[PDB]
Write a protein that binds this ligand. Structure first.
Ligand SMILES: Oc1ccc(-n2ccnc2)cc1
Ligand SMILES: Oc1ccc(-n2ccnc2)cc1
Ligand SMILES: [Ca+2]
Ligand SMILES: [Ca+2]
Ligand SMILES: [Ca+2]
Ligand SMILES: [Ca+2]
Lengths: 116, 111, 116, 111
């Protein structure tokens, strides 16, 4: 588990369940290439995106599909997605947890980075 | 010297007509009323105090979030938000809060 | 585990370890009475505050000692504490997780409430 | 029609001299430069666009948080913050962001 994503819903006070998450990695030609994707569980967590072998150094983008989440709850949200873009593993492998907190017109994200 | 600004993360708007009470901690560790008001159409509450009144000490800003949410028909978690801080050269304090039904964030802008 | 507290540090990207947490409950005479206290672990979590028997309906205050946390890291913070005040168990027992994210001049908190 | 405001949660201040670039999504799903500037002493960036230029569509506001933190000597996690949204009666948009080294929050104030 070198990359984990956790999503919470600030309106309902609950995990944000069935949220699609797409991860990209910057290629040598400076475009975003697909890297991994998945969906949050009933706990709001997404494990198993990648492996220690696959998760090399690079610039990664995690795009959390908040628009589809809100629309499925019958709410018209503001943002297309929540995200982080970050350089990973530059000083060696780390474990990253990306935690996102969602409201219809707002989001916040934090990273928890541990060594391992 | 002290301004409060409140935003609503659900509706994407200023939080209007929110009651705010400020207290200063007394020598017996109790909370003495100090200033209060309601946020304006811009979500701001100006005019709470004067330089001469606002001395160093511990202050509590209580934002009545529960009444706010209920007046909008939205189910809230917190009773209120209580933002407690120590006031310590030339300085103006803005206490800013961003509200959601089951979460809030606050930050201080000290200039 | 009907009440859990998790604290994260937004400056370091880490759990906030060894953070004191004090929980109070409003008494019949409208004052705050002590209810429980503890400290976050190396994961930033605090389990074992209370029990299903002890955690009755009431208005609770969770005071997270953020000032001592920052001061121990050699930083002068703004707030005395991070907190939540909430009515608990009004529609029957629930499990509450209070998640706090700390910066020297800011904090945010969220509640995750589950039935169980 | 579009304003950006940035706050610093570490120093308790406006985030001053932060580069901001706005992009509009083109028909081929690429990001076409639209507006840019640097936040002022108040943390605000006004004058990005005009009513006639700001049409419905998908916009990205990229805030260069990494350069901000490094100019303050503080070690940052994100490359930048990318705030992407759809613009849809009379409306003004404020994109507000609160920055910490390993976290940011953003909200929209639509009036
Ligand atoms: O599991 C989580 C998710 C989000 C969190 N958060 C993000 C911003 N504020 C809290 C905290 C913990
Ligand atoms: O969680 C927050 C709070 C305040 C914010 N802000 C208010 C004014 N400028 C940024 C943004 C995000
Ligand atoms: Ca390297
Ligand atoms: Ca002093
Ligand atoms: Ca009851
Ligand atoms: Ca339309």
């Amino acid at each position: 588990c070198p990359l984990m994503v956790k999503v919470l819903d600030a309106v309902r006070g609950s995990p944000a369940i069935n949220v699609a998450v797409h991860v990209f990695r910057k290629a040598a030609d400076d475009t975003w290439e697909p890297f991994a994707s998945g969906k949050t569980s009933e706990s709001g967590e997404l494990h198993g995106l990648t492996t220690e072998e696959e998760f090399v150094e690079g610039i990664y983008k995690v795009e959390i599909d908040t628009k589809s989440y809100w629309k499925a709850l019958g709410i018209s949200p503001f943002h297309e997605h929540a995200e982080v873009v970050f350089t990973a593993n530059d000083s060696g492998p780390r474990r990253y947890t990306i935690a996102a907190l969602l409201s219809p017109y707002s989001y916040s994200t934090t990273a928890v980075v541990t060594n391992p």
